[PDB]
């Protein structure tokens, strides 16, 4: 007839031969069967390449352990589809679209293909509206954008997930729209933790969760982000109501693409990443966008391999963002939380014509003081502060106090330390940092600027440390 | 008949098939046709390898866009030949031997193959005669050899082209022989600049220019140096009178050989260079020489990739030269011009038996002072100059004045500083640097040494700043 036949099985990549004239199109979904009674399942393969001689190379979305050569492969005729609609709010889903908490749910919904095209160029408009969070460093030096793309870069264990949870607490709770959370190649324990904490915070009824985690074959970790993005695209286009999209470790999407590319027999590029790194990253990231009149505020955590910010994956991700919060291990080791590197982080709306003159001036002054401190850091490391000029000593004192005052006790840090969170309005932040960079607090010790909120918290901690403002 | 047939076209490398017995020898010139009316031309192909089974792998000298598989390839039976004789002087030529400003000129001249063997060893003779240029640093620390091999090393955009223009101004303007200039894979703006500036100085009537620039395929950049070298070899062997051979960024020969080494089927060497790097560089560089009684004063510019003097191309070029003027970006960043590194540059006629006892003593003292200064620079940067001795502070003042007095306002840099150029005889240079090292000008500020000529210019600029000497 017209059904295929497995020929080669190289890991989670499967080559399938089809009768001529019946070759499945790229991205089509095929179904194979594993009959080994403990691993019995139905594999969903995705056509990746046409090899010739009626061969087709596909990426399996489930582990191929137990697959035999010559078994029948059924071409479904369409690409992988996921449920879309209001019904997906409040449930946990797979990369294939299967509900996890309530199996069989959503099989009667409208189903959308996970491979869409990005919006046309004539539909795009730049977003320059500030999103106020309540964090001092984020609101001052890297203000977030309403309907823009945000990322949190960082090495291993510097606070990317804790900052994702902080932004879920701050932005997604007081929200009026709908939220989607994709967990790409991350911990399953964290997925369960988020599921439970969104159930108890009464936020789950507005959030749709899609999880493809660390214990999945690279195809699942490559396509789960597309599934969640498809649900978000439905919420943006068909319903048009202020979507939020959190993606946990888009870098795991990149890494699964790397592994799949190695298995497909492609030539390795620099470092070892796939040759189609930027192309896949662009095909994904260009659908995470707000069109004219319809919003998607996006926030992604990006892992930085071996703390190497010049790695091809984060270096390619950088070009797709409106605000990049970069977490450093140097800042993380000093106990400053969030461990935001203030000199590397950036935002496209830190512009006098967007945030105002005083905001921008105070931010530039803070950055100048911190850059001078970083310039002196070498001499300070060998000879200490005692050898600098008097101007430089004053500036280093101001810079230590500033780099400590950018720290803050976050709402999500109450689980680690027991101290509740703090919200600081942006005007109070600007005023406080203006007073710092002007020298109005050079007498308060270096501590008492550590993990507090606004100026009242500073006054309380200084008066508990025997100082005044 | 006995013609060829194009079988494969992968970029600049073309495979051709010939009947048995009609296989062209290595380095022959074949002619193919491109008939597309917007790109119609006659491809010249240089036989590079015999692939077996009557196949032949050739490198194209023109872009292969528009070349069809199976077209006729005519074997000329000889290698690429260029016009030679006293009639090539005053004209701009091609890598193929075609006149650019007056096409058709030279088709009735004697034509010499561009492939030669280097002179026999029994004809080689060491050259130990100083070529007085007029630059303080060159005349002092890197005395050029008359009839010898000179090079200018340096990264991207330090001083090489300006220094070669300066040396064309100094050595070639009042020369009693012939000059040949090979522009090997350089800019075309600079080629037109040189053409116009040689027509202005009435030097063009004695100079033969051969240009294959950066926009040309790697075959032209690989063979233009050989064409110009064949013209110079004719002027040396047949006419026999005092050739000058300038070559801009000869490295481009190595780089063009490296661009096609993988397409020719060779495994790459250490830093991505061809395995035959040193062998080809030796085959080329050994023809650029003065035999006994026949002189060729050669002067090449050598690009150092990424300022790394350990790169295999400059590291292999270093062995073919009698004098090397090595330019640094650290000296370029300080405003000192020419940006010669006095501690890295060298010459073989820097010998008490060649340049005299006082020249050599002054040069060695300058080098010692500058080395001690380079050793103290880090201490001075971290701990401050007041931490040194009094001997060391004296030496540091002297070394700063000396490193500023090695700079000079060159004739070819009037376009960059608006200031006319200077010329300093070698005896004035020797005595001036003797007085500097002895300490006769330790009361003149650090300026008034910067971009000047001899001691009279030093007095003028010192009095312009309120000082004497």
């Amino acid at each position: 007839d017209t059904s295929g036949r497995v020929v080669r099985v190289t890991g989670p990549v499967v080559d399938v031969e089809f009768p001529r004239g019946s070759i499945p199109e790229l991205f089509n979904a095929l179904h194979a069967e594993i009959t080994f009674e403990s691993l019995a399942k139905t594999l969903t393969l995705e056509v990746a390449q046409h090899l010739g001689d009626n061969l087709v190379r596909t990426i399996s979305l489930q582990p191929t352990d137990g697959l035999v050569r010559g078994v029948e492969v059924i071409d479904t005729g369409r690409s992988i589809s996921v449920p879309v609609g209001e019904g997906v709010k409040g449930h946990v889903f797979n990369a294939l679209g299967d509900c996890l908490d309530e199996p069989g749910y959503g099989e009667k919904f409208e189903h959308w293909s996970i491979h869409r095209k990005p919006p046309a160029f004539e539909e795009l408009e730049p977003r320059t509206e500030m999103l106020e969070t309540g964090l001092k460093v984020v609101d001052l030096l890297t203000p977030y954008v309403r309907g823009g793309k945000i990322a949190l870069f960082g090495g291993a264990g510097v606070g990317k997930t804790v900052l994702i949870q902080e932004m879920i607490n701050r932005i997604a709770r007081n929200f009026g729209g709908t939220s989607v959370f994709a967990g790409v190649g991350e911990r399953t324990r964290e997925g369960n933790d988020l599921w439970v904490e969104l159930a108890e915070a009464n936020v789950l009824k507005d959030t749709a969760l899609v999880f493809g985690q660390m214990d999945e074959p690279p195809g699942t970790r490559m396509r789960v982000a597309l599934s969640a993005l498809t649900m978000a695209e439905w919420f943006r286009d068909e319903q048009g109501q202020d979507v939020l999209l959190f993606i946990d470790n888009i870098f795991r999407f990149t890494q699964a693409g790397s592994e799949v590319s190695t298995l497909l027999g492609r030539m390795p590029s620099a470092v070892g990443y796939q040759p189609t790194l930027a192309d896949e990253m662009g095909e994904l990231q260009e659908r995470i966008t707000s069109t004219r009149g319809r919003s998607i505020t996006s926030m992604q955590a990006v892992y930085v391999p071996a703390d190497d910010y010049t790695d091809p994956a984060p270096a390619t991700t950088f070009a797709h963002l409106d605000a990049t919060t970069e977490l450093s291990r140097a800042v993380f080791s000093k106990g400053i939380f969030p461990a935001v590197d203030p000199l590397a982080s950036s935002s496209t709306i830190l512009d006098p014509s967007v945030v105002g003159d005083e905001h921008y001036r105070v931010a530039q002054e803070v950055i100048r003081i911190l850059q001078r401190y970083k310039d002196l850091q070498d001499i300070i490391a060998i000879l200490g502060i005692d050898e600098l000029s008097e101007e430089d000593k004053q500036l280093v004192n101001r810079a230590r106090r500033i780099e400590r005052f950018l720290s803050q006790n976050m709402m999500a840090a109450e689980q680690f330390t027991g101290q509740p969170g703090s919200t600081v309005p942006v005007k109070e932040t600007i005023e406080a940092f203006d007073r710092l960079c002007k020298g109005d607090f050079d007498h308060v010790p270096e501590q008492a600027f550590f993990l507090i909120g606004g100026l009242d918290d500073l006054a309380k901690k200084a008066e508990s440390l025997g100082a005044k403002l | 008949d006995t013609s060829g047939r194009v079988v494969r076209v992968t970029g600049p490398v073309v495979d051709v098939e010939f009947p048995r017995g009609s296989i062209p020898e290595l380095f022959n010139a074949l002619h193919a046709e491109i008939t597309f009316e917007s790109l119609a031309k006659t491809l010249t192909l240089e036989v590079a390898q015999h692939l077996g089974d009557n196949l032949v792998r050739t490198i194209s000298l023109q872009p292969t866009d528009g070349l069809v598989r199976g077209v006729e390839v005519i074997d000329t039976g000889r290698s690429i030949s260029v016009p030679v004789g006293e009639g090539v002087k005053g004209h701009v030529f091609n890598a193929l031997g075609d006149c650019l400003d007056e096409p058709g000129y030279g088709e009735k001249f004697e034509h010499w193959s561009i492939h030669r063997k280097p002179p026999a060893f029994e004809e080689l003779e060491p050259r130990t005669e100083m070529l007085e240029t007029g630059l303080k640093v060159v005349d002092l620390l890197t005395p050029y050899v008359r009839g010898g091999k000179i090079a200018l090393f340096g990264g991207a955009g330090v001083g090489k082209t300006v220094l070669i223009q300066e040396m064309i101004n100094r050595i070639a303007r009042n020369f009693g022989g012939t000059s040949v200039f090979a522009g090997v894979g350089e800019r075309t703006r600079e080629g037109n600049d040189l053409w116009v500036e040689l027509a202005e100085a009435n030097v063009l009537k004695d100079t033969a220019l051969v240009f294959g620039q950066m926009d040309e395929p790697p075959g032209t950049r690989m063979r233009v140096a050989l064409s110009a070298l064949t013209m110079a070899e004719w002027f040396r062997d047949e006419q026999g009178q005092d050739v000058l051979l300038f070559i801009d960024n000869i490295f481009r020969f190595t780089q063009a050989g490296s661009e096609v080494s993988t397409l020719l089927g060779r495994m790459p060497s250490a830093v991505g260079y061809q395995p035959t790097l040193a062998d080809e560089m030796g085959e080329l560089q050994e023809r650029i020489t003065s035999t006994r009684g026949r002189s060729i004063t050669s002067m090449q510019a050598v690009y150092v990739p990424a300022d790394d003097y350990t790169d295999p191309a400059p590291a292999t070029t270093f062995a073919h030269l009698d004098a090397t003027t090595e330019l640094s970006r650290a000296v370029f960043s300080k405003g000192i011009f020419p940006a010669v590194d006095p501690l890295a540059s060298s010459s073989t006629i820097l010998d008490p038996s060649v340049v005299g006892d006082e020249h050599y003593r002054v040069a060695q003292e300058v080098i010692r002072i500058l080395q001690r200064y380079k050793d103290l620079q880090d201490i001075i940067a971290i701990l401050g100059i007041d931490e040194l001795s009094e001997e060391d502070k004296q030496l540091v003042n002297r070394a700063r004045r000396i490193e500023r007095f090695l700079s000079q306002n060159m004739m070819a840099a009037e376009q960059f500083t608006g200031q006319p150029g200077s010329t300093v005889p070698v005896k004035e240079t020797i005595e001036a640097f003797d007085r500097l090292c002895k300490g006769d000008f330790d009361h003149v500020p650090e300026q008034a040494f910067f971009l000047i000529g001899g001691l009279d210019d030093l007095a003028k600029k010192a009095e312009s700043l309120g000082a004497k000497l």
């Binding site: 950088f318 070009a319 | 703006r189």
Partner: protein, 50 residues
Amino acid sequence: TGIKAIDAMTPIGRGQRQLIIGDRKTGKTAVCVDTILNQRQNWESGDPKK
């Protein structure tokens, strides 16, 4: 280009190829867009030589 630093220290002429090289978020696109915007008076002049 309308920029003092570029027009004074690294001047650009018509026919030249000047490279704007740097890290990310240093002002490369800013420099190029300002160079484009500075030609408004040249365009409003009217003669094809300006």
